[PDB]
Enzyme design. Sequence first.
Site, PDB file in Angstrom:
ATOM      1  N   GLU B  35     -11.121  53.743  60.731  1.00 39.84           N
ATOM      2  CA  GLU B  35     -10.433  54.440  59.635  1.00 39.84           C
ATOM      3  C   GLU B  35     -10.205  53.550  58.393  1.00 39.84           C
ATOM      4  OE1 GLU B  35      -9.610  57.537  59.240  1.00 39.84           O
ATOM      5  OE2 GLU B  35     -10.142  58.340  61.195  1.00 39.84           O
ATOM      6  N   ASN B  46      -9.795  62.389  48.819  1.00 37.90           N
ATOM      7  CA  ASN B  46     -10.523  63.497  49.390  1.00 37.90           C
ATOM      8  C   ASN B  46     -10.951  64.524  48.355  1.00 37.90           C
ATOM      9  OD1 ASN B  46      -8.555  62.409  51.772  1.00 37.90           O
ATOM     10  ND2 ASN B  46     -10.672  62.735  52.292  1.00 37.90           N
ATOM     11  N   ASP B  48     -10.242  67.576  48.171  1.00 42.03           N
ATOM     12  CA  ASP B  48      -9.156  68.492  47.831  1.00 42.03           C
ATOM     13  C   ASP B  48      -8.068  67.848  46.938  1.00 42.03           C
ATOM     14  OD1 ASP B  48      -7.731  66.989  49.624  1.00 42.03           O
ATOM     15  OD2 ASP B  48      -7.233  68.659  50.948  1.00 42.03           O
ATOM     16  N   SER B  50      -6.160  65.333  47.752  1.00 43.68           N
ATOM     17  CA  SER B  50      -5.267  64.526  48.597  1.00 43.68           C
ATOM     18  C   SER B  50      -5.861  63.126  48.794  1.00 43.68           C
ATOM     19  CB  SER B  50      -5.078  65.205  49.941  1.00 43.68           C
ATOM     20  OG  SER B  50      -6.273  65.175  50.710  1.00 43.68           O
ATOM     21  N   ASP B  52      -5.903  59.770  51.730  1.00 41.06           N
ATOM     22  CA  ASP B  52      -5.629  59.192  53.069  1.00 41.06           C
ATOM     23  C   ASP B  52      -5.093  57.785  52.867  1.00 41.06           C
ATOM     24  OD1 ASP B  52      -6.563  61.426  54.405  1.00 41.06           O
ATOM     25  OD2 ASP B  52      -8.660  60.756  54.327  1.00 41.06           O
ATOM     26  N   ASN B  59      -3.069  61.653  55.838  1.00 37.08           N
ATOM     27  CA  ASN B  59      -3.357  62.493  54.666  1.00 37.08           C
ATOM     28  C   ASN B  59      -2.126  63.052  53.961  1.00 37.08           C
ATOM     29  OD1 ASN B  59      -4.215  65.444  53.572  1.00 37.08           O
ATOM     30  ND2 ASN B  59      -5.778  63.921  53.254  1.00 37.08           N
TER      31      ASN B  59
END
EC number: 3.2.1.17
Lengths: 112, 129
Positions: B35, B46, B48, B50, B52, B59
């Site tokens: 990750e 991301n 959208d 958002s 991480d 998120n």
Amino acid sequence: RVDQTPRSVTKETGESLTINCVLRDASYALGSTCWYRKKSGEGNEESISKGGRYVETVNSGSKSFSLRINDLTVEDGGTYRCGLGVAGGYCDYALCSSRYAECGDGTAVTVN
Amino acid sequence: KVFGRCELAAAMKRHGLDNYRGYSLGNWVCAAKFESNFNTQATNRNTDGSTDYGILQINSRWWCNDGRTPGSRNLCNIPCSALLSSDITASVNCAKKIVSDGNGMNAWVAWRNRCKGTDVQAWIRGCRL
Ligand SMILES: [Cl-]
């Protein structure tokens, strides 16, 4: 994957609807469950509050969860979807496209 | 902070992740490698809009409040900046919350892809815990 059955159903007013969901291919235990509805072509989804007319049956052993909707009326027409909740029972239709949950493909319900 | 492998294993064990919800410690270490590359300060945007955040790439649309998101769900009840610290406590506590419902460790897509189905114990081999 969450396999939701049936894909469509037509009912008469006063009848009851049953939708069945089963979680497949999962190494994890069945957690919280959620149910969503979009009134026909309205074009927004909403979480169903479980209770009263809306009776859920869960079997965590078989990772199965089912919704019965009683006393159907024409206003119950639309598309219904089951899904996994998160964070101890939080529900939101956008979870269905997230990495955090899974949802069934939906049931198109017509009530005459 | 960029953790070393055994350093992170030991930290995650002290923080109670070993066998948390039935996932052995190696799962957690492998997940963090894939990750974040073990980097506490890691961020990834991301599609959208958002982001991480942190060691476990949690998120902002769902789990933390970035302070600029109308109606922030903030399901871990934390500012996203808490997830960007050399101290992994907030990330671990949020991960525990996430893994305890939903799809378990599938919440970390890099886990699904690089860790699940492997000898995850390899990730703690040679470590003093
Ligand atoms: Cl990015």
